[PDB]
């Protein structure tokens, strides 16, 4: 969940839509102080940061030992494991046996040619086993298998779907509810503009009535300050 | 979401004061546009 | 941890826009309630 | 997944932050403009 708390003024859905110029203007200014503010890496809201393999208790050392090789390949993507030996699996050939090797060499390789070839027989008995297993019992274990595989797509489906369905409630009432505000901000923002207009034509024709009623003052004491001179 | 419904309803006093004491002081003005042409209206009374 | 960067990244880039959104906050307040008590002074010809 | 998420959250809230800059900006150069042109004129 966020843990954000920080409330902008931004109403997408009634606010127009921000020129690209201006935009990169804005995203070019805020580089800018994010230049001169320095950055706080102890910040509260930022989450705790990743621990390193060698003391979590997750990872055995075998662990940490296969990720330092597998870093220290110089490509991730294409490190391989160590095979094992089927060069030794595969069918053996018949040993060439030397006149001068001694009868107990000879016995001994010929031991290890039979110990491998006796491997391999009872290795192929046990795959030929299992192909008839899968000719007998296999379609219908395939066919039970891919049908609770697709269930189990079905069901991520139907999860994706229940969340896209609130995406849309959400985004439908708050485009009603957002529209409603933006005419009553639409309507207060051009009245407040009007009424500084008004004002200031009222005060405007105000300041010209009091030149005429000053003028007129100016016409009393003028005449009050005859006639005192004139009596 | 939330942070929206907070920031409409702030929006919503902020513009309404703005325009109640715009309005206030429109009404100010007509005070003034009144007392003036009384005093316009008594000098030409004292003149006439 | 490419991620974690990238957030920590947009992290600073939040809390520089906000503190500009504040700067400008009182900057709008400013120049509006400024604009709203603009009177009318007598407009004097030049003589 | 809770990297993830906050990250989404600051990538939204970053977006909304700039949309907030593009309106203060257009507030910010009507206001001026305005009260530019009427000191410069006077008689409105």
Do not use: C
């Amino acid at each position: 969940m966020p843990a954000i708390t920080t409330v902008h003024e931004s109403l997408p859905y009634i606010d127009p839509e921000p020129t690209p110029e201006q935009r990169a203007a804005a995203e070019a200014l805020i580089a800018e102080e994010r230049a001169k503010v320095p950055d706080d890496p102890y910040h509260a809201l930022l989450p705790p940061p990743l621990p390193p393999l060698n003391e979590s208790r997750h990872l055995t050392p075998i662990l940490q030992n296969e990720l330092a090789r597998l870093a220290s390949s110089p490509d991730p993507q294409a490190a391989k494991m160590d095979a094992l030996d089927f060069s030794r699996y595969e069918a053996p050939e018949m040993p060439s046996i030397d006149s001068s090797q001694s009868l107990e060499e000879t016995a001994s390789q010929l031991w290890e040619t039979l110990k491998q070839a006796y491997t391999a027989q009872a290795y192929l008995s046990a795959r030929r086993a299992h192909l008839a297993l899968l000719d007998t019992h296999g379609k219908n274990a395939w066919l039970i298998g891919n049908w609770h595989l697709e269930g189990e797509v079905k069901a991520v489906e139907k999860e994706l779907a229940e969340t896209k369905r609130e995406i849309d409630r959400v985004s439908l009432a708050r485009q009603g509810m957002q529209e409603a505000a933006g005419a009553e901000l639409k309507s207060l923002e051009e009245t407040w503009k009007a009424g500084v207009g008004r004002v200031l034509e009222t005060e405007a024709a105000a300041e010209k009535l009091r030149i005429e009623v000053l003028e007129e003052r100016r016409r009393l004491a003028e005449a009050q300050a005859a006639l005192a001179v004139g009596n | 979401r939330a942070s929206e419904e907070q920031a409409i309803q702030r929006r919503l006093e902020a513009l309404r004061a703005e325009v109640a004491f715009v309005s206030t002081r429109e009404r100010k003005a007509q005070e003034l546009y009144r007392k003036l042409r009384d005093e316009l209206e008594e000098l030409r009374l004292e003149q006439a | 941890a490419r991620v974690r960067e990238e957030l920590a990244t947009a992290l600073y880039q939040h809390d520089a826009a906000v503190r500009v959104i504040a700067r400008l906050t009182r900057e709008r307040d400013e120049a509006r309630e400024a604009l709203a008590r603009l009177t009318v002074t007598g407009a004097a010809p030049a003589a």
